Amino acid sequence: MFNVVLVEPEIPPNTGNVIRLCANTGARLHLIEPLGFPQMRVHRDWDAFVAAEAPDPARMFAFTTRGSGRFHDRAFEPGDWFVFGAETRGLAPALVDRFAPEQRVRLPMRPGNRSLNLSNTVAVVVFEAWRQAGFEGGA
Amino acid sequence: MFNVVLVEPEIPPNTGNVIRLCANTGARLHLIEPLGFPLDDAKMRRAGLDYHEYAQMRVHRDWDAFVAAEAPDPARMFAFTTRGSGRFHDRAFEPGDWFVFGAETRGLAPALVDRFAPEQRVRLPMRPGNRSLNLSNTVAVVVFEAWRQAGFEGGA
Ligand SMILES: Nc1ncnc2c1ncn2[C@@H]1O[C@H](CSCC[C@H](N)C(=O)O)[C@@H](O)[C@H]1O
Numbered sequence: 001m002f003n004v005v006l007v008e009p010e011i012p013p014n015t016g017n018v019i020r021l022c023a024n025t026g027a028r029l030h031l032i033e034p035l036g037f038p039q040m041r042v043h044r045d046w047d048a049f050v051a052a053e054a055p056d057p058a059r060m061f062a063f064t065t066r067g068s069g070r071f072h073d074r075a076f077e078p079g080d081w082f083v084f085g086a087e088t089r090g091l092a093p094a095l096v097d098r099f100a101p102e103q104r105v106r107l108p109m110r111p112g113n114r115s116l117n118l119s120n121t122v123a124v125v126v127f128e129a130w131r132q133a134g135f136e137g138g139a
Numbered sequence: 140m141f142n143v144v145l146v147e148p149e150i151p152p153n154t155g156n157v158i159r160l161c162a163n164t165g166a167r168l169h170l171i172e173p174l175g176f177p178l179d180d181a182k183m184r185r186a187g188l189d190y191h192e193y194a195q196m197r198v199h200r201d202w203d204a205f206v207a208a209e210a211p212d213p214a215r216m217f218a219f220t221t222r223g224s225g226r227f228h229d230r231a232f233e234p235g236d237w238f239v240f241g242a243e244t245r246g247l248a249p250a251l252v253d254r255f256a257p258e259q260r261v262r263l264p265m266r267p268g269n270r271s272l273n274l275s276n277t278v279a280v281v282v283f284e285a286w287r288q289a290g291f292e293g294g295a
Pocket residue numbers: 062063064065083084085086087088089090091105106107108109114115116117118121
């Protein structure tokens with residue numbers, strides 16, 4: 001339905017939450033090693049992820065608080081790739097650089113230095129994408 | 140503007156996450172006792188939550204005191220349950236609405252669910268036969284969907 005990609009996740013409970021979200025929504029989960037702890041696929045690194053999956057870059061979105069891409073605008077489609085960063089530092093700047101600026105997407109928040117919980121961010125993005133697809137598969 | 144109501148929450152990290160989600164979204168948080176855990180300013184600070192992030196949170200002795208104290212519009216209060224509900228996303232939400240969630244393990248007590256008209260009963264869509272979502276994630280999805288319908292007013 002959709003692809004969730006967690007880059008170097010750190011905190012076990014967030015990934016547990018996301019596995020549960022994927023199961024409920026039909027999203028496929030991709031974890032990019034190294035992880036902070038010991039359908040789902042685990043990839044040695046980012047480069048291996050791209051070689052294995054060959055994502056269409058036009059349909060790849062990097063969620064980051066530093067993004068200028070607006071969440072509210074965005075049309076998501078089945079098969080898109082929703083990429084999320086680790087809890088402490090977020091996505092590495094050099095990885096965010098590979099996404100075109102409009103593909104770097106920020107979820108709105110009240111003013112100030114803030115970020116959403118990782119698993120919350122993933123659930124909002126997936127449910128909004130799922131809404132746009134009419135919740136196909138859902139009861 | 141939006142209100143989140145946790146009825147008898149059990150798992151402490153869920154409530155901690157919901158406090159932060161409310162600060163990030165500008166939602167008001169209400170808890171209804173009995174809680175599954177103590178609330179102490181030292182425990183909060185230890186969790187990494189700053190005083191002003193949770194100072195406006197309201198704790199209610201029980202449901203009837205909550206209603207008495209807040210006087211929520213029944214037509215604008217939504218209960219999260221499976222019994223007789225419709226899909227959450229079907230409903231049009233307004234600033235100031237109330238979203239009522241039960242314990243992640245228990246769900247809302249039938250006693251309470253029976254007080255809500257079917258129209259006000261809502262659930263998130265799920266693929267059949269799966270465990271429910273983490274409560275924190277459910278609240279996030281709820282608040283961000285209601286906020287989307289208001290055009291993310293006051294957010295950027
Ligand atoms: N408002 C928001 N918009 C888009 N993505 C967000 C978000 N809040 C959190 N995230 C996602 O959640 C991940 C972990 S939160 C990252 C926190 C980091 N210290 C920072 O200041 O950004 C991020 O890498 C990002 O994918």
